[PDB]
Symmetry: D3
C-alpha cells in the first residue's frame, strides 16, 4: 500500500502542507454540496489496497465538516481501501467528554462511535482536550502534542525565555504548563478563578512570582478567550512585564477577536490545527506555529511502522 | 412506560401538532449551539424508563439537524430511556442509496449506521425515496405513506378527479402512481425524458396529476408539466410528500403552468408558501401521531397504509 | 498471500473457467452431503495466509448452495485465511430487497448479514437486481456489469444493430437499456403493462432488443415480445445476464417469437440449452477472472465497467 | 405481550400439538417457495409487541428448513415483535460442533451465529448433541431433556424395568445413561467398539435398554444390539430423543433384534413408522409447550428437567 | 420483574445493608473457588424474568472480585434475567483511564468492555475517578456522588464548618471541592500535584488561602495516603488551623495506616464503598459514612423508573 | 512485520525457551502490581506494525494471570500492533465449558469473549479440555496436541512399550488414548467408576499407561491406578499435558503406585517437582515455537499434529 492523502473542506492549506512534506499530491476528491445542502463526495481516483489518510479539522462549520469526514471515510472504506486513517487535528465535541450532574450527551463518545462505524481504522489527532477520549475508541488513537513546537517557538521568539514563567490559566492547565516549564527549566505560576460569591468582581488567584518578568500563559485551546483574558488581566495586576498566550487550538469564536485586541497580550500564538488567516486579518497579535511537520511525520511513521511516540519529545 | 415526544429544531410546528394529537406536551429539551457552533443538547426532564420519540426531519441545515438528532438520541439512551424512536418524516441522504458506477459513498447506509450506533431502537419515516433503505437498518423501520392523505386531497379538491390522469414524472416512481390510480380507478399516464419528453396515456382535455415522492429543484416536475401542457391537458397538478424546494425551485414553480403544487408538511413550508402562491400543504401530523400511538400500544401500524385516521 | 480459488457445487464449469484464466488449479475441497442431508465441507489444503475466493452462484437448489457457501467461508475463516471473498455471480434472494407494504422479510439483507457473520471480507457479484443491495453490506461489494460483453455480442451477432432498438421489459430496469442505447447510439423504446402492454419508440421494420437483468419464468420477456411483434418488429431478441429459466420458462421461450434468448453463464445453462434451441450463452468468466485478479493486485476494478478484457 | 406460535414447514403436527396444549391457534403465516425455489415467507398477522415462538426442527430438507427459520425470524424481528424465540427441537448441524484435527467448519457455531444475526432473542431446544453448543450463543438457550418422558415410557412399557440394564452405545454419551440408571436405580452396562464390541455389565437373561441422543443411520445402535444379543440379553430396546433414520436406517432396524425402537417426536415419524413396525413415538409436545409457557411467564424452566407436566 | 440482589465476595456487609434497606433477602448464590483457584459461581434460585442487581466493589483481591462479578453477570444473563445491573461502588482500574505519553493500556476501558460483553445492561457506581469513564460504556452508567452524605457529615461534625476552606489535593478533585464549597458557601483551595512514579507523590503547589482556618481535604480515594499526607503537610505549612480528610473510597493499601497514624489529621472520613473494619482496628482516626441508603435508593429508583439524579443533591 | 514475543508473569521459563527457539529476545514489558493489587502493564518497546505473541498460561493465580493477559493484549492493540496472538498453553476455565443442568456460567465462553474484546486476533493453545471451545471464538484458534511429544517419551522411556496398554482414566477422554494406541499399535484398556472401578483390556503382567489431558487434584488418576494395580499390571504410568497438581495432589501422587507421572511444561513444574520425585516433565516449547513460527510465516500448523519438530 501507498499513502494517499485526502483533504476535507475544513483545512485545505494544512493538508497541502502535509502532502508537500510527504512528497505527495493530494488525492483527487470532489467534496461539495447538493442543492439541498447534503454533502456530496466523489473519490476521483482508485484507493483500492491503499493506505488512506483523510485530513479534516473540527472547526468552521463543525457539523458539516464532521459529516463530510464520515462520508469520505465511508466512501474510501467501500472503495476497498486497505486502511483508512482519520487525521483530525482538532477533535470536534472534545469538550463534551462527560455528563457530570447533567442529563447531557457524551458527544465526544458519540463522535468516536460514528468515526468507528464509518470505517476508520486509525485516528491521528493533536492535543485532545482530555486524553481519556482515547478510551472512547477501540481502534488505536495517536494523540500528538504541540509541545515540542511550542518549546521551539518560545526559545526562538522570546529573548528572556530563560527568565520567563509559564502560567496555567485554569486548574486543568497546570500539568501541561509544568511539563513545559520542566523542559524549559523555568519557574511556573498557577492561576484559577475563585468562587462566584464575591459579587463585587470576579477574583483570580495567582500563586508563583511573576513580577517584573515575562509571563507565558499556555493552554490547549482558546475558544471565546475568556479564560486567557481573565488570566492576563490578573498577571498584569501582579506586575508581569509582558504577557504571551500559547495555544494549540485557535478556535477564536464569539467575541474572541475583540477581547484579544482589547487585552494586554504581547502575542497570542496558536498552532495551525485550525485555519487562522481570516482571524489574523482582524487581529494583529495572532501568530501561528506550523505543526504540519508533526502531522506529516506522524502519518509517515504510522505508514512505515516507525515509532510515533518519538514525536512526543523530538521536533522533526 | 409513557410516551415522551421531543422536538428537534428542524420542524417545531410538526412536533407540536403531533403532541397535540396525542394529548401530550413536548418534552423539555434545550437544543442550541455553543459559541463554536457545536450542537448543545440538554434533556430537561427525566426520561428514565420512558418511551421516547424524537421528531426531526431531514431538511433545512441538514447536517446540523442530523447531528442534533443523533446527539439527542445518545442523550436519551444514556439517560436510561426504555426505548428511543427516531421520527424522521423526511429521511436525510435518502437519494444516496447506491453507488451504481461511481466511487461514491452510500450515504443513506452511513446515516442508518449512525442512527443505530447512537442508540435508536426504532425508526418512523414517511415515503422513503427507496424502500430498500429499510434494509439498511437492523432495527425495525416503519415507512409510512402519504397516499391516503393524497387520495383524500384529490377527492376533496379536484372536481374532475374521476376523469383525471395520474402521471409519474420519472419512470422510477411509477409504482406510486399505479397504486394511486388503482385506488381512484383512473388511468396512469407515464412520462420520461429521451431534452424532449415522451408521454403515454390520453391527457387531452383532462386533468393530469403528477405524483412524486419529492420536489427538490422542481426540474423533474416542471419538465413533466411542460410535456403535459404540450398534449392539451386542461390543468396540471403536482402532488408530493416532501416539499424540499431548494435552489431555483420557487421561481420555476412560479413560472410553470401548475394549477397547484401540493406537498405534505414533512418539511416546514411557511417560508416557501410566502413566495409561491400555488403551494398548498397537506397535514400529515395525524398519520405520524397515529403511528407513534400504535407503536407505543402494540397496535397495527400497517393499518395506516390504507386508512386515514 | 496467493490467490486460492475454491468452487462450490453450484457452478463447477464457471469456477474452472475462472481458474484457467488465472493460471491456477481449483483448490482441493470436498463439498458433499451427510446421510441426513447436512452439508459436509472439508478444505483439502492449507489456506493459512492466503487470499481465498469461493465461487458459488445463487442458482439450482438455492438454499443448499447458500448454506454450502456460508459453511465454506466459515471453514476458510477459521483456517486463518488472510482474506475471504465470496464470488457470487447471481446473488440469491436479490429480488426480496424490500417489504413495500407487506409483513415480509427483507431476505437479501438477511443473506448479506449471514455472509458477513460467516466471515466474508469482500463480495464480488454481477448485475445485482437492485444496486441498493450494496448498502446491505458493511464490507466492500464489487458489482460487475455484463454490459461490455452484451455490447460485444450485439455488435458481433446482429447485423442491423446500428438501426436496432433497445427495449426495457419493465419500467424498473430502463436505466440499463438507456446505458446500452447510449453506448450503441440507438433509440431506447420502452414497454410496460397497463393484460395489455404500451410501447414507445419506433420498432416497425427494425430489430428490437429486450435487455433485462434476469429471466426467471420468462413471463416478463414473453409479454414484452408479444407487444413488440404486435408493432411490426422484424425480429425480437432478449438479452439477460441471469438465465434462471425456472418453471414454465423453457416452454414459453419455445412458443415465443424470439430470434434469440441470450444469457450470460452466471448460471449453468447446458441442461436448459438441451431443451431450448434459441438460448445462447455469453461467457463472462473473463470479467470475473479479471475482477478477482484486480482485487488481489490492488488494481482498479471499475475499469472493467467499460472495458472487455 | 401475548404468545404467538408460528410453525415452519418442517414439523407442522408438532407445532399444532404445542399450540393446542397452550390453548392457542397457530399464527397465520405463508411459508412456500418461489418458482426458482427461494423461500417465500409472509406473516399473515401483526406480531407487533408480541412474544413470538417459531417452531422448526432440523430435519427433512435441513438447509431449506434452516433458511425458512432464519427468514421467519427476520420477518418477525423487523415487524417489531417484542421478543423472538426459535423453538428448534432437533438442532441442525449439532454433530459438527468441533474441528478436532481437520480443516473443517464448526457448522454448529455458524448456525448459532446465523440465528443470532437473524434476530433470535432466545433458543429452546431438546437434547443438544453436545451441551457445549449452549456456549456457541450469546443469547439464552434452554436445552430441554427427554429424560423424564423416557423414564415414564420405561416404567409404563417394560415390565422388568427394575431388573433391566441401561446401556450407552458409544462411550461419549454414557452420562445420559448414568443419569437414567440413577433415576431408575439400576445398573448401567457400557459398550464401545475396539469391528468388535466390548461390554461391561451383566446383561444375561435381562432386558438391556440402549439410550442415545439420536439414531441417524442406526449403525451405532445396531452394532451395540448385536453385541448385547451376543451376551444373552433376553430383549434389547433402543430409546432415542431424535429419530432421524436416514439412509439405510429402516432396513437395518427391520433386520435387527430390537424389541422396540422408541423415539421422541422432535422429528416427524409417520412416514418412517409406515415402513418399520417396531418404531414407537414418545410425545414431547407437553415438555415444549411447558417450556414456552414458563419462559413467557417468567417461571422456572429447569423445573422441567426432572418433572413430567 | 422483581428486584433480586446478589452479593459478590468483596463487600458482603454492604450488600446486606442494601438488601435490608430494600426489604429483600440477598439472592441465593454460591461464590467460591475450585481447587486450582478458578472462580466457581452457582445461582441458587431462578432469576428468569427478574431485574438482577449484583453488588461487587473493586477492593481486596481486585482481579478475583472482577472475575467473580463478570462470571456472575454471565450466569445471570444466560439464566434469562430480564436485566442485569452491576452495582460497583468502587470501580476497578478506574485510575488507568488514559495513556498519556506511555505505551500503557487503558485498563478502565478494557473493564468496561468486559462488563458489556459479560451482559451487563446497566452500571451503578459512586464517585468515578474520572467521569469520562461513563463514556467508556455504551450501556447507561449511573455515577452517584458521596457529596450529599459528605455535606451531612461536615455539618454535623465540624463546628467551624461555616468558616473553613475546602481543599482539593490534586487537579482531578477540583470540581468536587468547588461544588462542596458552593453548597457550604465557603472558600476553596486547589493543590497541584505532580507524580513521577506510581503510588508516589513528587511535588505539590498550594493555590488559594487556607491561613488560620480549618482545612477540609476532600478527595475521591485514599490508596497509599501519600496524597493526603503531603497535602496535610502543605496545609499546616500554609497555616491551616486543623486538617480533616474526607474521601469516598478508603482503599488504604501499602503504608497507608502507618502514614495516617503518624499524620496530623483530626479525622479521616471514608464511606463504606470498601469494607473498613480491619483498617479501623489498627487506625483510630478513620470514621465511616454509610452510603448504603444512596445505593439502595439508586437501585430502587432505577427499578421503578424514578429519577436517579434526584439523589445528586438529596440524602434519602 | 516481525515477531515480538512477550511473557506474562505466569510462565517466564517457558516464554524464554520459546524465544530462544525462535532466535529472539523477549520483548521489554513491565508486568507488576500497583499498591492496591491492580495489574500494572507497561510495554517497553514499540510494537507498531509488529506481529505480537503474548505467552501466558492459565495456572497459578489464575484470575491475576488472565487479567494480566487481557491488559497486555489491550496495551498491544491500542499501540497499533499489526496482529496480537494470545499463546495460552493451558486455557483457563476450560472445564467450565457447559451448564448441563445447573444455573451456572459457561466461564470458558466468557473467557473467549473477554479475549476477543481485548483485541486478540488469534489464539494458540494446547490440548483444550473440550475442542468445542474452539467454537467459543470467532477468531482462529490453533489447538496444538502434546501427542507427538508423548509418543516420543513413551518410545524412549518405557522399554516394554510394544506390549504396554494405553488406559483412559475417564470415559470422556478415551479418544486421546485410542489415537495414541493406534499410533503405537497397542491395545487401549478402558476404566470408569461405577467407589469401585471397572476395567476392560488385559493389563496383567503388562505396563499400563494412563493418558489424560490434565491432573488437577489427581483423584482421577489415583483411582484409575488403584484399579489397574488391582488387576496385576507390573507398572503403571500417568502421562498428562497439563500438570496443575493443586490441593492434595502431591501427597496423593507420593502415596500412589505410579512408576512415573509425566507432564508437559505448559505449567511450571519446578516447585511441584521439588516435593514429588516421580514427576517428570516433557518440554513442549519446540511445538509452541514451531506453531508461532508457522503462523507468522503462513506455513501449515496442522503439520505439527503428527510431527515432532
Ligand atoms: N441531495 C441530493 N440532491 C441531488 N442529487 C442527489 C442528492 N443525493 C444524491 N443525489 C444524486 O442523485 C442521483 C440519484 O437520482 P434519482 O434518485 O432521481 O434516480 P435513480 O436513483 O438513478 O433512479 P430512480 O429513483 O428513478 O429509480 C445520484 O447521482 C445521486 O448521487
Ligand atoms: N425468487 C423470487 N421469485 C419470484 N418473485 C420473487 C422472488 N423473490 C421475491 N419475489 C417477489 O417479487 C416481487 C418483486 O418484483 P420485481 O423486482 O420484479 O419488481 P419491484 O421490485 O416491485 O420493482 P422494480 O424492480 O421494477 O423497481 C416482490 O413481491 C417479491 O416478494
Ligand atoms: N449430519 C452428520 N451426519 C453424519 N456425520 C456427521 C454429521 N455432522 C457431522 N458429522 C461428523 O461426525 C463426526 C462426529 O461424530 P460423533 O458426534 O458421533 O463423535 P465425537 O464427537 O467424535 O465424540 P462423542 O460425541 O462420542 O464425544 C465428525 O467427524 C463430524 O464431521
Ligand atoms: N477448575 C475447576 N476445577 C474443578 N472442577 C471444575 C473446574 N471448573 C469446572 N469444574 C467442574 O467440573 C465439572 C466438569 O467435569 P469434567 O470435565 O471432568 O467432566 P464432564 O465435562 O462432565 O465430562 P467429560 O469431560 O468426561 O466429557 C463440572 O461440574 C464443572 O462445574
Ligand atoms: O495513592 P495515594 O497517594 O493515596 O493517591 C491516590 C490518588 O490517586 C488519584 O490521583 P491521580 O494521581 O490519578 O490524579 P488526578 O486525581 O488528578 O487524576 C486520586 O485522585 C488520589 O488522589
Ligand atoms: O472559555 P474559552 O476561553 O472560550 O475557552 C478556552 C478554555 O476553555 C476550555 O476549558 C478550554 O480547555 C480552555 O482552557
Ligand atoms: O478431578 P481431577 O483429578 O482434579 O482433574 C483431572 C481430571 O478431571 C477432568 O475431567 C480432567 O479432564 C481430568 O480427566
Ligand atoms: Mg481548561
Ligand atoms: Mg424520482
Ligand atoms: Mg425487472
Ligand atoms: Mg453418540
Ligand atoms: Mg485525584
Ligand atoms: Mg477427563
Amino acid at each position: 500500500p501507498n499513502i494517499k492523502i485526502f483533504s476535507g473542506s475544513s483545512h485545505q492549506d494544512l493538508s497541502q502542507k502535509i502532502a508537500d512534506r510527504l512528497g505527495l499530491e493530494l488525492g483527487k476528491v470532489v467534496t461539495k454540496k447538493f442543492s439541498n445542502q447534503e454533502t456530496c463526495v466523489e473519490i476521483g481516483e482508485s484507493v483500492r489496497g491503499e493506505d488512506v489518510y483523510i485530513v479534516q479539522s473540527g472547526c468552521g462549520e463543525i457539523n458539516d465538516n464532521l459529516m463530510e469526514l464520515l462520508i469520505m471515510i465511508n466512501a474510501c472504506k467501500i472503495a476497498s481501501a486497505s486502511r483508512v486513517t482519520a487525521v483530525i487535528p482538532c477533535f470536534p465535541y472534545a469538550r463534551q467528554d462527560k455528563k457530570d450532574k447533567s442529563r447531557a450527551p457524551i458527544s465526544a463518545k458519540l463522535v468516536a462511535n460514528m468515526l468507528s462505524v464509518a470505517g476508520a481504522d486509525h485516528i491521528i489527532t493533536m492535543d485532545l482536550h482530555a486524553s481519556q477520549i482515547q478510551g472512547f475508541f477501540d481502534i488505536p488513537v495517536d494523540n500528538l502534542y504541540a509541545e515540542p513546537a511550542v518549546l521551539k517557538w518560545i526559545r526562538e521568539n522570546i529573548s528572556e525565555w530563560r527568565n520567563c514563567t509559564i502560567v496555567s490559566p485554569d486548574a486543568g492547565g497546570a500539568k501541561r504548563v509544568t511539563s513545559i516549564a520542566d523542559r524549559l527549566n523555568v519557574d511556573f505560576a498557577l492561576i484559577h478563578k475563585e468562587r462566584k460569591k464575591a459579587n463585587e468582581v470576579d477574583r483570580m488567584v495567582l500563586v508563583g512570582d511573576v513580577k517584573d518578568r515575562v509571563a507565558i500563559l499556555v493552554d490547549d485551546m482558546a475558544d471565546t478567550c475568556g479564560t486567557i483574558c481573565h488570566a492576563a488581566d490578573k498577571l498584569l495586576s501582579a506586575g508581569a512585564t509582558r504577557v504571551y498566550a500559547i495555544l494549540t487550538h485557535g478556535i477564536f469564536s464569539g467575541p474572541a477577536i475583540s477581547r484579544i485586541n482589547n487585552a494586554c497580550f504581547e502575542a497570542v500564538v496558536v498552532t495551525n490545527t485550525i485555519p487562522q488567516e481570516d482571524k489574523m486579518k482582524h487581529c494583529s497579535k495572532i501568530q501561528v506555529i506550523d505543526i504540519s511537520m508533526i502531522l506529516a511525520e506522524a502519518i509517515r511513521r504510522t505508514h512505515n511502522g516507525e515509532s510515533v511516540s518519538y514525536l512526543f519529545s523530538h521536533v522533526p
